[PDB]
Design a binder for this molecule. Structure first.
Ligand SMILES: Cc1cc2nc3c(=O)[nH]c(=O)nc-3n(C[C@H](O)[C@H](O)[C@H](O)COP(=O)(O)O)c2cc1C
Ligand code: SF4
Lengths: 430, 71
């Protein structure tokens, strides 16, 4: 019912980089077509188009982009206000922003200009992760090309809007992907996220009103503006609509990143574009639908689950970055989740107690339960510790660390039961 | 931790932990006779009175014979 996008309906037409990704390729593919007219149309008009386009945040939160942009102050106060574009993707399984920046950087720049115009932002900062250095060089060259051509600067186009885009790179931190942690790191401090009595739309980058927006949303902004909000709302279903690019990785035959219509069945997504599970559909054990943050799903749910915000939320999971990591019967999901917990323990900033200590405790417990050196009441205690960590931590990385363990306990509990009983029998024998 | 302190070589759950405290042996000990048992198996009152009276009579007879011999 949903899926099967055509090449004309696909937004990122250079996803694999088979054509020139620079300005000439951008003009040939249809970038910077009527940016002057789009800017002249109006900030309120752009905000209304985003609101009625059904676009939702692609960074994992899923918040409506139009409303998030409308949260900015309308009256220009003394503070200059800022746009920030989250190119710092470090959640395991997702690499969509890497491809976007590497092969369609002019789309990203035009999106930055459009978002800044629509949110009355003086300047934009693109926060690239430190690992992406070739992508950073490509984006630097694209930005220099745009500045030379006059697409950015004092006169972005025939319009009189003042806009300057700068790019700042991190130094390899996963917490820096969070909005407030990214603002703190861009200030030159440690990547420690702030609390949320001051929202970033009120006191953000330098205490000025800033808006943190994902690369995919900001890049698809000009395309949906030029092609009509109705065209974007045609794909998908209900609230969650549009075109989302999924990275299918893991034990699939031919892992790949492909842009597809929202609300496509997960099975149809896997066995049509990617190629399918390594040993057929029956070989599939568990799929993490988003990045490592969201809980996994067993083979039973993945038969009919739909890859979108709502169905994945109708089941106890989330779309997140919509990068599916599959695991067949050959691997051990307990070890996979133990490695995920180790990653979260390593990448927690360690400012707030439930995540600084709880992530390490979860990793140690998962390492113990991988071999089977635990108890039934200890897996119950692991679930209780997950609940304790979840709701009492500064940012959503506590939730991202708690969710995979909770999902593994919910779904693959008999595996842990068998491992613990087998280890108990072996200990008794020894 | 209670499980760490009372760990068993081959236990899986926190239950059935090893335990050994002072208590009854299987069978619950034996009765201890809280009551009192005082048996009165002594000579009867009439028997001792008759013994005393006969002893007095025969002794007075012996006193008479001894006094006769001494006289
Ligand atoms: C642990 C953690 C990891 C995050 N990773 C990313 C990321 O890879 N990319 C991103 O754009 N935002 C990331 N964020 C921030 C949120 O996705 C945030 O909603 C986003 O920057 C703005 O939302 P948007 O999807 O509407 O643009 C992360 C947040 C947390 C707490
Ligand atoms: S939940 Fe706390 S410890 Fe984890 S990264 Fe966020 S602020 Fe740091």
């Amino acid at each position: 019912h949903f899926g099967g996008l055509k090449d004309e309906d696909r937004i990122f037409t250079n996803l694999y980089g088979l054509h020139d990704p620079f300005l000439k390729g951008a003009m040939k593919r249809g970038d910077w077509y009527r940016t002057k007219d789009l800017v002249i149309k109006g900030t309120d008009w752009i905000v209304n188009e985003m609101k009625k386009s059904g676009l939702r945040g692609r960074g994992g939160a899923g918040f409506p982009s139009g409303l998030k942009w409308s949260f900015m102050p309308k009256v220009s106060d003394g503070r200059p206000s800022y746009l920030v574009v989250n190119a710092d993707e470090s959640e395991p399984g997702t690499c969509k922003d890497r491809e976007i920046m590497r092969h369609d950087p002019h789309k990203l720049l035009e999106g930055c200009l459009i978002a800044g115009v629509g949110m009355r932002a003086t300047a934009a900062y693109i926060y690239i992760r430190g690992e992406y250095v070739n992508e950073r060089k490509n984006l630097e060259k694209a930005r220099q090309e745009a500045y030379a051509a006059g697409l950015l600067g004092k006169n972005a186009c025939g319009s009189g809007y003042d806009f300057d885009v700068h790019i700042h790179f991190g130094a390899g931190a996963y917490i820096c992907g969070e909005e407030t942690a990214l603002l703190e790191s861009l200030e030159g401090k440690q990547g420690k996220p702030r609390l949320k009595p001051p929202f970033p739309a009120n006191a953000g980058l330098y205490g000025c009103p800033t808006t943190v927006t994902n690369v995919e949303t900001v890049a698809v902004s000009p395309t949906i503006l030029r092609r009509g909000p109705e065209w974007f709302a045609g794909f998908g279903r209900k609230n969650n609509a549009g075109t989302k690019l999924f990275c299918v990785s893991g034990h699939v035959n031919k892992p790949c990143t492909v842009e597809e219509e929202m609300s496509i069945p997960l099975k149809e997504l896997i066995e049509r574009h990617c190629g399918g599970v390594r040993g057929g559909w029956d070989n599939l054990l568990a799929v993490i639908p988003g990045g490592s943050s969201v809980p996994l799903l067993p083979k039973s749910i993945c038969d009919d689950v739909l890859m979108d915000y709502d169905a994945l939320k109708a089941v106890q999971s989330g779309l997140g970055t919509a990068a599916v990591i599959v695991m067949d019967k050959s691997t051990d999901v307990v070890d996979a989740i133990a490695r995920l917990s180790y990653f979260y323990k390593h990448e927690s900033c360690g400012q707030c107690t439930p995540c600084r200590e709880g992530t390490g405790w979860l990793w140690t417990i998962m390492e113990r339960m991988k071999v089977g050196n635990a108890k039934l009441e200890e897996i119950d205690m692991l679930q209780e510790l997950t609940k304790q960590i979840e709701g009492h931590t500064i940012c959503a990385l506590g939730d991202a660390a708690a969710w995979p363990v909770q999902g593994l306990i919910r779904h693959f509990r008999p595996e842990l039961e068998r491992r613990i009983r087998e280890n108990a029998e072996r200990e008794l024998l020894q | 931790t209670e499980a760490y302190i009372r760990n068993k070589p081959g236990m899986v759950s926190v239950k059935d932990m090893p335990v050994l405290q002072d208590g009854p042996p299987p069978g619950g000990f034996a009765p201890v006779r809280f009551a009192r048992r005082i048996p009165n198996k002594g000579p009867s009152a009439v028997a001792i009175f008759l013994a005393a009276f006969g002893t007095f009579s025969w002794g007075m007879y012996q006193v008479g014979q001894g006094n006769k011999i001494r006289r």
